[PDB]
């Protein structure tokens, strides 16, 4: 009975020894590492003896006792490097009120480095040293778990404190978040305890990233007012041959993507948090791009109207390019899988940008409005001089076809050099928008110049509309043909508006109805 207590004494004595294995058996000494191995051997033998002979329900066996001693050493080890962080770091690494500070994060970066040295030491030394129970005792594995867990407890508390006072640059919080992710993924993420993930660490830094985003938006919005002036001062030059937009466009999206790339490198493993960053950054993209549009749409006229006309086209191309490179970001932020409220704001942004390209195109087309009205009054005058010339030599006769050409000649001289210039320097959509707009403008002006309805006059008592003065048969025919020709002129054999669009154009239908009042001479009953 005095033997069983003599054994317990010995078992306990070795427990004390191993509970400080690192300090008692330095990795520097190979022979001391051997002694450590001998010490574990002796412990198991004592345990094996007790389990075979005695039947005290078996206290460990061995592996669980050593494990608990190793966990102890780690708790002590963590305490050591926490209290001696500064000295340990500056002595081995490098390039007062020590311990955690609230004015700087330096202490935590140095602590991480020391933590790694410990884990690495337990992997490279000790683990091969203590190889008695490979299935059940991996010192390096258990070193990483304990060291991370002890570090996580302090880091969580530190960031809650930093949340209240802020005081450090957003950069410094951002980098620490990055360095922690590296530590977690390198040593912890593939551990049984943690494998199920949803790790807690990103939540510690969440308010610091949001702040960085808040600062980032105000930085981007600042970079905007600058990319545009640099472009405007350079005179919105087309970049290169097949890129119909200017430099301010590539500058903005490089800035937006660099910023997004920062969030991406965080590799946030908490989707709920990832949705938060995406929801916030989407607001940044919106406010930046909308500002680009709002900046341009507030200056568009001054470049347009009076020649030249290249710049207004490019400004529209730019605005279109915003639309295409947004969608490219939408996929980069993982479209469809993207947070709903985030994709919602971006899809509401594609609409706003679209409804700006339209507004812009309308302003541009209207810059031709006066000259068009002049060309249309000119073509109404020519039409009014259309006569039948029967009893007259066959060479002096002007045909319906020749007459229609003469009617359209003013407006064609106007548009020719233009349409031609566009299409050459507009994206398809930009060109189509301008043509659709110029189309509506020509049809409307024609409806309100050559074919204004008869006026009202007081008839007997109650103001009736007068009878329309019918065009002559030759006049009707010249109108019809000229009209049909403009349509083909805007179709342009498959570069202009589609024939389906022109036909169902409500502006063409109104002009045809207006025309119908005057064209009674040739209109068929029974069509």
């Amino acid at each position: 009975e005095r033997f069983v207590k003599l054994l317990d004494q010995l078992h306990n004595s070795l427990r004390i020894d191993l509970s400080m294995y690192r300090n008692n058996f330095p990795a520097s000494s190979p022979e001391r590492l051997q002694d450590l191995k001998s010490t574990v051997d002796l412990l198991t033998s004592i345990t094996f003896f007790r389990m075979k002979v005695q039947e005290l329900q078996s206290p460990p066996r061995a592996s669980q006792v050593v494990k608990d001693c190793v966990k102890a050493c780690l708790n002590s080890t963590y305490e050591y490097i926490f209290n001696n962080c500064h000295e340990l770091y500056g002595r081995e690494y490098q390039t007062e009120e020590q311990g955690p500070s609230i004015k700087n994060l330096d202490f935590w970066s140095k602590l991480i480095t020391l933590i790694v040295s410990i884990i690495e030491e337990d992997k490279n030394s000790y683990t091969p040293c203590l190889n008695q129970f490979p299935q059940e005792l991996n010192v390096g594995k258990i070193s990483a778990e304990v060291m991370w867990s002890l570090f996580a407890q302090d880091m969580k508390y530190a960031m809650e404190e930093h949340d209240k006072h802020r005081l450090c640059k957003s950069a410094d919080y951002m980098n620490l978040h990055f360095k922690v992710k590296w530590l977690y993924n390198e040593y912890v993420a593939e551990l049984p305890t943690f494998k199920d993930r949803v790790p807690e660490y990103p939540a510690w830094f969440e308010p610091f990233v949001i702040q960085w985003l808040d600062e980032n938006e105000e930085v981007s919005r600042d970079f905007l007012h600058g990319a545009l002036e640099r472009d405007k001062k350079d005179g919105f030059q087309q970049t290169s041959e097949h890129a119909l937009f200017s430099c301010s466009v590539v500058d903005v999206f490089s800035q937006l993507n660099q910023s997004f790339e920062i969030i991406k490198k965080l590799e946030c493993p908490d989707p709920q948090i990832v949705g938060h960053y995406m929801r916030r950054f989407a607001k940044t993209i919106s406010n930046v791009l909308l500002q680009y549009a709002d900046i341009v749409s507030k200056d568009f006229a001054s470049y347009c109207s009076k020649e030249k006309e290249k710049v207004p086209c490019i400004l529209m191309n730019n605005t279109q390019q915003l639309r295409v490179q947004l969608e490219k970001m939408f996929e980069a932020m993982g479209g469809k899988e993207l947070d709903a409220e985030a994709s919602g704001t971006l899809k509401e942004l594609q609409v706003k940008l679209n409804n700006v390209l339209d507004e812009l195109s309308h302003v541009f087309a209207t810059s031709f409005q006066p000259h068009i009205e002049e060309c249309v009054r000119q073509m109404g005058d020519i039409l009014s001089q259309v006569k039948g010339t029967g009893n007259v030599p066959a060479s002096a006769c002007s045909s319906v076809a020749q007459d229609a050409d003469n009617v359209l000649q003013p407006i064609m001289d106007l548009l020719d050099s233009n349409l031609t210039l566009f299409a050459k320097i507009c994206e398809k959509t930009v060109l189509k928008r301008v043509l659709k707009e110029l189309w509506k403008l020509v049809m409307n002006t024609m409806e309100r110049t050559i074919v204004l309805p008869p006026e009202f006059s007081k008839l007997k008592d109650h103001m009736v509309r007068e009878e329309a003065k019918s065009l002559t048969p030759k006049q009707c025919a010249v109108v019809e043909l000229a009209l049909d020709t403009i349509k083909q002129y805007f179709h342009a054999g498959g570069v202009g508006l589609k024939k389906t669009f022109l036909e169902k154009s409500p502006d063409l239908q109104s002009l045809r109805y207006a025309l119908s009042l005057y064209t009674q001479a040739t209109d068929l009953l029974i069509k």
């Binding site: 548009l415 020719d416 233009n418 349409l419 031609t420 299409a423 342009a492 054999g493 570069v495 202009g496």
Partner: peptide
């Protein structure tokens, strides 16, 4: 000529 050929 047609403005869309050149």
């Amino acid at each position: 000529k047609y403005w869309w050929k050149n």
